[PDB]
Amino acid sequence: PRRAPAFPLSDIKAQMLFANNIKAQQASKRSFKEGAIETYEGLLSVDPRFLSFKNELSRYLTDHFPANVDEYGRVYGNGVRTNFFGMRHMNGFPMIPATWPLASNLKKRADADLADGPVSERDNLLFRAAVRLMFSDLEPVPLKIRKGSSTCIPYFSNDMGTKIEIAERALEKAEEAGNLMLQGKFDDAYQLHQMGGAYYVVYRAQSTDAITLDPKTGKFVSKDRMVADFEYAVTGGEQGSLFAASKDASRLKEQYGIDVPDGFFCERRRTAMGGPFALNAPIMAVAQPVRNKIYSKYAYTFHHTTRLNKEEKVKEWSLCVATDVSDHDTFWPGWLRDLICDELLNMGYAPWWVKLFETSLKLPVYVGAPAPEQGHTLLGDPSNPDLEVGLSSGQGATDLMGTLLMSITYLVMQLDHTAPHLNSRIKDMPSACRFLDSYWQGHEEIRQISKSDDAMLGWTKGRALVGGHRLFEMLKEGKVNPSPYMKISYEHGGAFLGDILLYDSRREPGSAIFVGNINSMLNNQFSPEYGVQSGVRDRSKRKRPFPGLAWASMKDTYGACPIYSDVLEAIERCWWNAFGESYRAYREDMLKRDTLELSRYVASMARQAGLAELTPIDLEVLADPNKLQYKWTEADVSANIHEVLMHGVSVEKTERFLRSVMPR
Numbered sequence: 001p002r003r004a005p006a007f008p009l010s011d012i013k014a015q016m017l018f019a020n021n022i023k024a025q026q027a028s029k030r031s032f033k034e035g036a037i038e039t040y041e042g043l044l045s046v047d048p049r050f051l052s053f054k055n056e057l058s059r060y061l062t063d064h065f066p067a068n069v070d071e072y073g074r075v076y077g078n079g080v081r082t083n084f085f086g087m088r089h090m091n092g093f094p095m096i097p098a099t100w101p102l103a104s105n106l107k108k109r110a111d112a113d114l115a116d117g118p119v120s121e122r123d124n125l126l127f128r129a130a131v132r133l134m135f136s137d138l139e140p141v142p143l144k145i146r147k148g149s150s151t152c153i154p155y156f157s158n159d160m161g162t163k164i165e166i167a168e169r170a171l172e173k174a175e176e177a178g179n180l181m182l183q184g185k186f187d188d189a190y191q192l193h194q195m196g197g198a199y200y201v202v203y204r205a206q207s208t209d210a211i212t213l214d215p216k217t218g219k220f221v222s223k224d225r226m227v228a229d230f231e232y233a234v235t236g237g238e239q240g241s242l243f244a245a246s247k248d249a250s251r252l253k254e255q256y257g258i259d260v261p262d263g264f265f266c267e268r269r270r271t272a273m274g275g276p277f278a279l280n281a282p283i284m285a286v287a288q289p290v291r292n293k294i295y296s297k298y299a300y301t302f303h304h305t306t307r308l309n310k311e312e313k314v315k316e317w318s319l320c321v322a323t324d325v326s327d328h329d330t331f332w333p334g335w336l337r338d339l340i341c342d343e344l345l346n347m348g349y350a351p352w353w354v355k356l357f358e359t360s361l362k363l364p365v366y367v368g369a370p371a372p373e374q375g376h377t378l379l380g381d382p383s384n385p386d387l388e389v390g391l392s393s394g395q396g397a398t399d400l401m402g403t404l405l406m407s408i409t410y411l412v413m414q415l416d417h418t419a420p421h422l423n424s425r426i427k428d429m430p431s432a433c434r435f436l437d438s439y440w441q442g443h444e445e446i447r448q449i450s451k452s453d454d455a456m457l458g459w460t461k462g463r464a465l466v467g468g469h470r471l472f473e474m475l476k477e478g479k480v481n482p483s484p485y486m487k488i489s490y491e492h493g494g495a496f497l498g499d500i501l502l503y504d505s506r507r508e509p510g511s512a513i514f515v516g517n518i519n520s521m522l523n524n525q526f527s528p529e530y531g532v533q534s535g536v537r538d539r540s541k542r543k544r545p546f547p548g549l550a551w552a553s554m555k556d557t558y559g560a561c562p563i564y565s566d567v568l569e570a571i572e573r574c575w576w577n578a579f580g581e582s583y584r585a586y587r588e589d590m591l592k593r594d595t596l597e598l599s600r601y602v603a604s605m606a607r608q609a610g611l612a613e614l615t616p617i618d619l620e621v622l623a624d625p626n627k628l629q630y631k632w633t634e635a636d637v638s639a640n641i642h643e644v645l646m647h648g649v650s651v652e653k654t655e656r657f658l659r660s661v662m663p664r
């Protein structure tokens with residue numbers, strides 16, 4: 001059913017993806033790399049004292065605080081959902097090999113019994129209504145760019161000046177490039193305007209992954225992570241193999257002279273993609289206004305800030321169902337891309353813009369280094385983009401694509417299993433739009449709070465209520481998938497956007513509270529995804545600009561966890577045993593240094609201003625800006641802090657661009 005074309009780096013098609021500069025050329029050739037991350041300044045992830053600390057702490061916490069999750073996946077009591085063994089990884093050393101990204105998910109979806117299009121006309125109207133509501137009356141805003149982010153194919157520039165030039169030129173030339181693509185002249189659009197080419201595959205660490213302690217021997221077992229070899233990826237699973245990657249860390253002693261303590265493993269590695277920035281800029285120019293619309297008009301369903309902001313909504317529900325989606329990005333359907341594009345064309349969106357948008361979700365992928373002596377291969381032909389990878393992580397509107405698919409998928413699940421009497425309200429496009437507009441504002445008796453593949457489904461006092469309980473029962477039983485679109489299950493230990501929903505004896509949303517996930521505190525403090533990058537002079541360009549700041553927001557983020565105090569004391573005791581030092585004093589020093597360093601970046605901040613004016617969100621984001629890409633948005637961050645991490649293209653240039661894209 002059609003193998004995707006593949007080209008080695010030596011091939012001209014792959015060579016064309018990399019500009020004649022050191023950064024781009026290094027990116028093309030970058031071999032498999034592994035090594036200990038600098039967890040904190042002067043501390044490596046594999047430091048023997050640090051691993052001794054992690055061994056003692058993970059064992060102690062699991063022992064004293066076993067998971068409190070009921071048969072329905074509801075968290076109660078201590079607020080713990082699993083063991084604390086997830087920290088037992090040799091950060092910077094990946095599982096081998098990493099997966100080759102699937103060039104086509106058509107067979108993956110078909111074999112998982114998932115739909116190749118909207119099942120009913122109602123569903124077709126609902127997916128189309130989602131497009132209409134999300135993309136309608138948009139307001140232009142400056143195109144914001146993350147400082148230090150790469151422009152990827154073809155330039156691989158990290159320079160803000162160069163990135164602003166690229167983005168402004170892209171907004172000027174998007175029309176001409178889109179029109180070339182409409183003529184099937186993809187190579188011309190890429191050669192002239194760098195719009196096309198491929199996504200650049202980077203493998204990102206999922207620093208913590210499941211580990212269990214088998215009671216019979218007291219030996220640890222890491223969660224098997226299935227990977228596709230090259231053959232499987234190009235054939236969409238028709239040929240080749242899907243097998244468990246090796247997380248065995250024994251190799252580190254022989255290869256690097258690193259002592260590997262018992263029950264420590266290599267990290268899970270996930271595919272992540274970097275989009276060609278010239279193609280992403282025109283997409284982002286529309287995506288940001290869309291976010292502003294959905295987070296304002298549809299704030300009920302889409303705008304999530306604090307644990308209390310989420311709590312106010314959930315407390316009003318009679319039933320709360322915390323869902324889980326299996327491998328969202330890889331299962332994301334291409335037919336949805338086509339439906340979205342078709343509906344945007346119907347709305348009167350510029351055909352050239354829709355073509356750029358369509359093309360961004362069919363683009364080839366350049367595979368770097370999944371393992372030693374593997375990779376450096378382009379999948380798909382950039383002359384005619386036709387990949388079905390699912391959702392590319394580096395596409396300019398990935399969050400919106402995931403949110404659109406999932407919001408409608410959950411609504412359809414609630415309609416199918418709990419609310420058939422609402423079907424008559426969805427007769428045509430105007431009525432589908434009225435219903436969806438009402439549903440998204442939380443005005444219906446069936447409700448939801450969602451962001452991409454994370455959601456909580458709600459039922460108020462209902463006639464759909466009884467159906468809601470049957471659906472929850474079906475999810476617990478787990479024998480039948482409740483959706484035709486994606487593989488849905490219930491979350492084992494229900495959480496929403498990092499916050500655990502802590503139930504009491506009644507097991508009802510009305511008396512349940514949202515608390516910080518204590519395990520995430522431990523993940524963030526002891527298993528960061530990246531090193532401190534102390535060699536990167538401009539801190540605003542680092543993956544972790546001000547790590548010390550997370551100490552100041554810790555009480556606010558995690559304080560409500562039942563075991564918060566117990567964990568901090570266990571950390572102090574274990575850190576004393578391993579280093580002969582106070583962890584609290586160590587973090588207070590890092591906080592002091594990072595607070596002082598921050599004033600250099602903030603114009604409004606005097607030489608020794610302090611953190612008084614900053615919110616806990618601002619502090620969590622300054623320690624980890626990756627939270628700005630999955631947890632929060634621009635509006636949630638103080639304006640003076642947003643300027644530290646982002647720079648923008650003028651609203652004058654974007655306003656003119658947006659007027660040319662949008663209907664009338």
Ligand SMILES: [Mn+2]
Pocket residue numbers: 322323454455491494495496497
């Ligand atoms: Mn969840």
